[PDB]
Design a protein around this ligand. Sequence first.
Ligand SMILES: NC(=O)C1=CN([C@@H]2O[C@H](COP(=O)(O)OP(=O)(O)OC[C@H]3O[C@@H](n4cnc5c(N)ncnc54)[C@H](O)[C@@H]3O)[C@@H](O)[C@H]2O)C=CC1
Ligand SMILES: NC(=O)C1=CN([C@@H]2O[C@H](COP(=O)(O)OP(=O)(O)OC[C@H]3O[C@@H](n4cnc5c(N)ncnc54)[C@H](O)[C@@H]3O)[C@@H](O)[C@H]2O)C=CC1
Ligand SMILES: [Cl-]
Ligand SMILES: [Cl-]
Ligand SMILES: [Cl-]
Ligand SMILES: [Cl-]
Lengths: 403, 403, 382, 382
Amino acid sequence: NTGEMKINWVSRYMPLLNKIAEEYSREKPLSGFTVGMSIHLEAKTAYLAITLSKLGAKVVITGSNPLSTQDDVAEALRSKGITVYARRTHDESIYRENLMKVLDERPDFIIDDGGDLTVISHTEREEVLENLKGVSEETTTGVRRLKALEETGKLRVPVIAVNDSKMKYLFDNRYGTGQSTWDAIMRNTNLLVAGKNVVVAGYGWCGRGIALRAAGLGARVIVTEVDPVKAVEAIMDGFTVMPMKEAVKIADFVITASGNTDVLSKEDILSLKDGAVLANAGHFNVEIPVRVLEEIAVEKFEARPNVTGYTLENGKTVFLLAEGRLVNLAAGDGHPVEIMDLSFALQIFAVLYLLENHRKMSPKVYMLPDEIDERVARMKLDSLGVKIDELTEKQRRYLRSWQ
Amino acid sequence: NTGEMKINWVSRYMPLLNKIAEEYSREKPLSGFTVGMSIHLEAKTAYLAITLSKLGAKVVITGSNPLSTQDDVAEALRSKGITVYARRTHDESIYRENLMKVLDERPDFIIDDGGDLTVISHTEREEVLENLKGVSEETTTGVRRLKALEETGKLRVPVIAVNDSKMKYLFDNRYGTGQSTWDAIMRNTNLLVAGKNVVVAGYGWCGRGIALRAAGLGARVIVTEVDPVKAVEAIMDGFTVMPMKEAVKIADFVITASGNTDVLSKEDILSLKDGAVLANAGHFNVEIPVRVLEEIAVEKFEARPNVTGYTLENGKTVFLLAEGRLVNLAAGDGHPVEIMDLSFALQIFAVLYLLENHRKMSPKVYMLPDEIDERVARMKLDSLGVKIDELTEKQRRYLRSWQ
Amino acid sequence: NTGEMKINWVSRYMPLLNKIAEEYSREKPLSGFTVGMSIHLEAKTAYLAITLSKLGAKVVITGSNPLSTQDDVAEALRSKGITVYARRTHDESIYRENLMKVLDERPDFIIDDGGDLTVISHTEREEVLENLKGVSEETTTGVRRLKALEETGKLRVPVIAVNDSKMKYLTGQSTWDAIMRNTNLLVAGKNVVVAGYGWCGRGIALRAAGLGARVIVTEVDPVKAVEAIMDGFTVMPMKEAVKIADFVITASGNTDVLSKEDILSLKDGAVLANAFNVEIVRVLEEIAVEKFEARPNVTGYTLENGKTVFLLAEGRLVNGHPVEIMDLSFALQIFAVLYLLENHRKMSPKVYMLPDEIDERVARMKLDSLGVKIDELTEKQR
Amino acid sequence: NTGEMKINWVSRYMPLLNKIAEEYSREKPLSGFTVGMSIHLEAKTAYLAITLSKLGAKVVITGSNPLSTQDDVAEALRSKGITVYARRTHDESIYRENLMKVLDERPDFIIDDGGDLTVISHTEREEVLENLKGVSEETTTGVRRLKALEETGKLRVPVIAVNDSKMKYLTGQSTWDAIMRNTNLLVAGKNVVVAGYGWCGRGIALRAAGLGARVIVTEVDPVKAVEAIMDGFTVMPMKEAVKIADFVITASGNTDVLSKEDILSLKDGAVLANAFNVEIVRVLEEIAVEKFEARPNVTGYTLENGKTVFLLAEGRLVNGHPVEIMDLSFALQIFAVLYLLENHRKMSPKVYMLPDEIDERVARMKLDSLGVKIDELTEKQR
Ligand SMILES: NC(=O)C1=CN([C@@H]2O[C@H](COP(=O)(O)OP(=O)(O)OC[C@H]3O[C@@H](n4cnc5c(N)ncnc54)[C@H](O)[C@@H]3O)[C@@H](O)[C@H]2O)C=CC1
Ligand SMILES: NC(=O)C1=CN([C@@H]2O[C@H](COP(=O)(O)OP(=O)(O)OC[C@H]3O[C@@H](n4cnc5c(N)ncnc54)[C@H](O)[C@@H]3O)[C@@H](O)[C@H]2O)C=CC1
Ligand SMILES: [Cl-]
Ligand SMILES: [Cl-]
Ligand SMILES: [Cl-]
Ligand SMILES: [Cl-]
């Protein structure tokens, strides 16, 4: 069926996950443990779930899928004994309920998205903390929220921040996040990017990728920031940096990539050109203040699929993509297959590290242990047939000396 | 005179150092302190010394200049009251003696190159430790040697590793180290790089820059490594990775960029093609084993300026550039002026941080304090006239929350 | 109305057509003239039709349109007094009948597609030549056909090749964007084989290297092979290159760039693409024990050796434009029709290149709409 | 011997000339023939002379050589029986006398520089035409002059334009490499102004953007200005661009691309470069209160406003080759002389393009020396 075909495609090109299954599927180290997951459901993340199941885990998943798609992939997962709640998750109260359903299964380990399950676990479903042994979190927003639980002394389980990885810097995110973001914008609008002014708010991993891709498509790029180091980076990449209040005066597209709230103010929005297009690439739908748009608009209308027009008190109309939600995951090509294979390998090993070591770990956010980065790098090399050098004893002693 | 003209050129394009002088030259925070320095002497580093002097420091310098050049720059520094010992430093025992001369001045702060002054201070000139308040070290080799003093419990003063900087990743070192390395190789050999096999040993900051520039010049690049993460990086940049023993069989150029010893063995050297060219971009002259070359060669001859031919037992001749010493600093264009301005600003602030805080600091190697990176980034933005955004209170509270 | 909302969206982002309406909709230079059109019917082309109408033209359109998806746009054009013959055009004989219906209206000017209206006008409906004053042709196939018509001595009206324009660039980048979209696979750290090192192959190879691929080039011309080596690529025979290829891209314009032995040497999961319907397919179809659709635009062929290989886009060129790009194209086409209006009596029955003055006028209008100012040459200059 | 060591170095890295010696030094096709040459005398060109000699030629050379730095190479050639007239060639009349001395030897074939030997042969030393059988010309100025000689009807011997070769590419990259070398300044994070957006300007602009510069383009042609915008650059008038420029690069092939008012608007420390002796200089010389040499290849001009601006390479094209590149060039030139040897009786007194067979032979030899194998077309192909 179509769901099995989507999974079969990705399985061909996930050599690390396939090697992990080869290495551990007989031993079944996760037998008798439940792994709860919050993911965007699609064939790649389905393969992560499948690999966890091959390792013996009971896997229970909620999908953030406001797109109303990948049902075929959900049905394929059900046929393999994996529990998936992803339908109707455009409605936030349904996504929330589906998280509650994952927590009803009393997971031993959580692979979280944006920290959603873990935060609920510490705020409203504290009975799950008895059984919860560890959390793996991959996103910046997630790490931020979990670090805040830590700093306020509310965190109760060890968390591994997998976005630590030495291998984030490995790939250029212009062909991951940048490419998938511009593909989505181009599909929703059919507008030219070349020769346009594109404003990117935030110049971290996500924003830089979006900015570089926009420049590759021939746009004039303007970057906004609050961190002076990041602003200097953007300048040294050839971009213009200025405050948002000035940038909005000339923007054709404004893309938020900050992980922050209210990156446009009311006054910024009233400065936009007639026909400006706004989109969000951050985790939550508050970067572009949709509630402010809805409050100040004289008229609201659906201009085309996935595009909301807001006509302002000043007579101008601005357009919001995807209700200000994350724009680039709907089509299921957020990142290349082999990049997700790498990321998922790191997450599987993070879960196995927590299985082995959680009793020894404090309720703190840890950086990804270096041994995991090295393990996965070595497995990648082996899968490519690449051999490297080994230090001699003379060399080891040289490197530990002050000669 | 020519020395003043060289300094006048760089002073025009060092806005951070000029701003630092504007900010601090009246207050003279370094009045009554001696700063000892080991540098490659040229107009840029001369300007660092000049700026320290404007801040009140007595500045005493040794130049690693086996090149036998920049005398005019040394004479210009002398005319401004700065003490410079750089002549005849091709002879290692003279470079050593010049280090001893710097330590005779009992420096309060050291700006070191490769840790040379600091290591001598801990091993042979321990009387200088009474007055020594802090060390700033910029190179990887330096940090390694000082960390080894720390790990063995021999370090006695605080050290700031300025190569920590958030801003190392700012510039692409293919147009710093990579460009200056290939310029030197091209000048010494007059050989084509395009369509050649180039082997780079080590894929850190230095090696990656060298590899990318070689690829930009049209060479087929092969990378050797001992760190699996770095090897995966090289593969993801489009290069071939294999063990040195295989790479040497096809190499036209072998460039060492490891910070290690004996990156070629005798057996590797006997595998090289007739006419292979070898060069070192690492700090010390032991990466390419010159003593092994000298020991196993049937004949040795100067083939052209800066190029030594070694004819081996196998009948083949290989060529070594610059006696296996660092190849790219002789021409004084190692890095662009404005990049050195940034680096030197970080080093000046590191010295001022040590002045203010050394009594509170342990005898350990510290990462560059984050406040210094941010200070210098802000100064860079201000010098370019760039303004950025400031977080609102709502935003600050959002970022400290788990919502 | 959904048709009207589609047209309203594109009208917001078609500044050249909007400025053309502003400049000419009171003069109405095309009042009393009929413009016949064959075009793919959708909101953008609808806006070209609307703009011609604002200029006074009676517009009569055939839509080559094998799906009903743009029938709401058709219906919106009909409500504006534009005549649209588009429904049921998935059948070949109905497309032709709709072309006949356009010609029944005795157009003064034709905006053609593949030269279909013009060729019928010269062969089967010669009475239309009485009133036909000029033809604008933007399609490559169309300009080819009308040029061939000229060379037989049978062309009877002036034609403007709008695609022969200094702004013709409506690459390696396009090819890899398409490959990545259709496969969702990583290019970095892969072995990419490019067959052929002319302008196209070289661009594909350079872009692949910039994406982090290790690139191998195959060639038959030693001069081109040396060029590939000097660009930093490995050159070797295809028989060797296929043993390590993750992607094989034929850019060579030869037949049978892969033999049966080459295909049986491919790695399991290799991806094949053309960037002719003969470079790589008949060979694949002949040797494959199973053919299946793996993904949209990706066909799997499982071979006698148990391995499976993947062909992109059934072997067609793997490398349909944004609103503002169509705006630019449509402005050149409107001005070409106006040039024919003004000048057809002085023009020969031949295919003319787009007059350079039209390129410069549209470029200037584009700059004006962007708020851009440029320099002007001084007397001494020039 | 230092001359001999220089020649020994280059002989190690000239595999095409070494293979040519291997193939022809026993046949000695040039025995009984004199080859006259005007060339810049250094170890690489010495090796061309040596190789011609191994093929049997009596070689007689003039060195256009305004310094004595390569007199050791000259002396080494003299020890091998090659006749060298190079000393004191910093004086113009001595260079000419040395050319006269080459022609005194009644060359059968000339390898010319700027066409100097050939033009003298046709104007003042017509007796040489009795024995002169062919001319090889690799220089652009030379091919221009000999082509002009043909068009007057006064050319009397066959000439091969070796530079009209499919391997002619002996860019934006060259320009910025030169700028960086001569200034040691950062390009990233700077405002770069590029005047002109033809092939050259576009390459300079694209490379600058890839180095991290913010690029501004100035133009007078609206079509080119739109192209620059669609590439992601800012377009504005030069009068505005100069107010923020860190670098201004004229790539436009116009006169006076900068006025006096433009120059007085430059930032203190702006860097100017041409990539004609008239784009930017006379204006600078006229307005400057002080001129000084700031660095090698960099002139400072201090203006009436107190600011100083910097001109690279006195306004000459800011954008002399590796050993293996000269090897390739010399192989084409040797084969051109051999082609003239074999075929001059069948050739007209005109300038011929390099025969394509010579391109293909040298490319094949280059591939062979690298150990590279390529494909070959099948019958069906094709
Ligand atoms: N759409 C996707 O596929 C992805 C989404 N994300 C999400 O995107 C967001 C950013 O992620 P990362 O780039 O990894 O974060 P990051 O922390 O590396 O970068 C965010 C940047 O935004 C800046 N910033 C914060 N507030 C700002 C403001 N008011 N104006 C301008 N700049 C501001 C920060 O200084 C920082 O440099 C997070 O919400 C993350 O979860 C991240 C990666 C992929
Ligand atoms: N020439 C110049 O201008 C510069 C010189 N340096 C010097 O270059 C050296 C390297 O510096 P960085 O790149 O910052 O160091 P790094 O530590 O970032 O990178 C060195 C790399 O070499 C690898 N390596 C170590 N031993 C190896 C071996 N036997 N074979 C292959 N790879 C091996 C390590 O795994 C590491 O990835 C140091 O000596 C440093 O002081 C650094 C920057 C500029
Ligand atoms: Cl723009
Ligand atoms: Cl891109
Ligand atoms: Cl090669
Ligand atoms: Cl490069």
